[PDB]
Design a protein around this nucleic acid. Sequence first.
DNA 1: TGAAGAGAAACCAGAGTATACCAGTTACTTCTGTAACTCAATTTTCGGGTCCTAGTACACTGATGG
Length: 205
Amino acid sequence: LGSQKLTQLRDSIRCVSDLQIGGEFSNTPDQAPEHISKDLYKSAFFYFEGTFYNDKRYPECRDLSRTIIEWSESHDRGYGKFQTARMEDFTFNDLCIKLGFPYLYCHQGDCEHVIVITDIRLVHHDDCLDRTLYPLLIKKHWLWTRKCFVCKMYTARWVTNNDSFAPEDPCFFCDVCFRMLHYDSEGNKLGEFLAYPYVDPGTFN
DNA sequence: TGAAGAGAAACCAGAGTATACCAGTTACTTCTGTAACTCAATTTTCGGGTCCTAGTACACTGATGG
Ligand SMILES: [Zn+2]
Ligand SMILES: [Zn+2]
């Protein structure tokens, strides 16, 4: 919605990089899940025609654009004259952009999404008229879902690297086939591996 | 009065002789690099598409059988 703050769209973009759980759970897979990456790395920024609207709303937020502006303040790199902003003092109605031109939305460190303002139109009477739901999803992609590599009946909850049982190197397992292949009777890892929790992108996105 | 050689008119291979190639080398040039601006021609390379054939997921259908 025009005249609707930025960070009203940043908080709406469903990306699975917000739901990834950190750390490795090989020794014991019953650990209290570390906070999803939505909570740990709260920083993000839009880039709209030479101005990094940074999400400095929270204290855990740090300037992701500082890296780029420093990297460009060095040796000339094509780019030049980068700006900054705060993304809570801005609405889409205050923004000076091109249509159909790719801009940036970086979040979770370097999960980059290419933003394209396809068109701008005055609101009609036959579309949604609310605001409580308006940065709303017109279309999404319906990605594929990874499955457990042992039995192809359930989706992958775990991804293991350097597994001394897996044929493939990154091997995805459901919970059942993971518990059954790597753990003797009480949680002592059998063999060697690095198991991480796997958020299926084709499910939470 | 034959004998042991004397003379005579044929072939026959071979040793110089005659060619017959077949290399063996002296000058005498161009062609490098660097520099520069010019302009057009040509190549390279380089990130990304592009089309195509072949599976793949996934919700639904359509029986099927116990
Ligand atoms: Zn993302
Ligand atoms: Zn499984």
